[PDB]
Design a protein around this ligand. Structure first.
Ligand SMILES: [Cl-]
Length: 171
């Protein structure tokens, strides 16, 4: 398997097959392995980036996950004052196997490449959680806060979807 983005070492986590062939996907079990500290001696810090809209996040998110659905907010939190180290890992996810997580992963890479001299990166190791929150929640509910799941296309949240889409850079 290939080396990470800055070509310093291999990808630490075991991968699974996903929609986007050029991106690295991880299973819910691997996400729990990270959260339980099985890689604590190698991983300094990791950020779970929930790319869903605020209402989806508020209705149930993975513990310690940061809500960064907008590109400018994701770039501000991650790249204005970078999380320096051991390894730094980023995990992006959305609801299921949609485009929000993968698109944010590619964006952060594009901006990470732009603010650095090739091939150095602030975030060389980035993954996508396979199945997103929809597959994580029924497997590990106690690793979620609150213990609920609010879909994007929830009946009572049609206006909230609309209001938030109008805050995005492109559609
Ligand atoms: Cl955006």
């Amino acid at each position: 398997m290939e080396l990470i983005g800055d070509y310093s070492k291999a990808f630490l986590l075991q991968t699974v097959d996903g929609k986007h062939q050029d991106l690295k996907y991880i299973s819910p079990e691997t996400m729990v392995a990270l959260l339980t500290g099985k890689f604590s001696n190698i991983v300094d810090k990791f950020v779970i980036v929930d790319c869903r809209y605020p209402y989806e996040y508020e209705g149930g998110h993975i513990k310690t996950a940061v809500n960064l659905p907008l590109e400018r907010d994701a770039e501000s939190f991650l790249l204005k004052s970078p999380i320096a180290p051991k390894r730094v890992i980023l995990i992006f996810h959305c609801e299921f196997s949609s485009e929000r997580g993968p698109r944010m992963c590619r964006f952060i890479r594009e901006r990470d490449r732009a603010v650095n001299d090739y091939p150095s990166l602030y975030y060389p190791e980035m993954y996508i959680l396979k199945g997103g929150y929809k597959e994580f929640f029924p497997q590990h509910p106690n690793f979620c806060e609150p213990q609920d799941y609010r879909p994007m296309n929830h009946e009572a949240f049609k206006d909230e979807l609309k209001t938030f889409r109008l805050k995005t850079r492109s559609w």
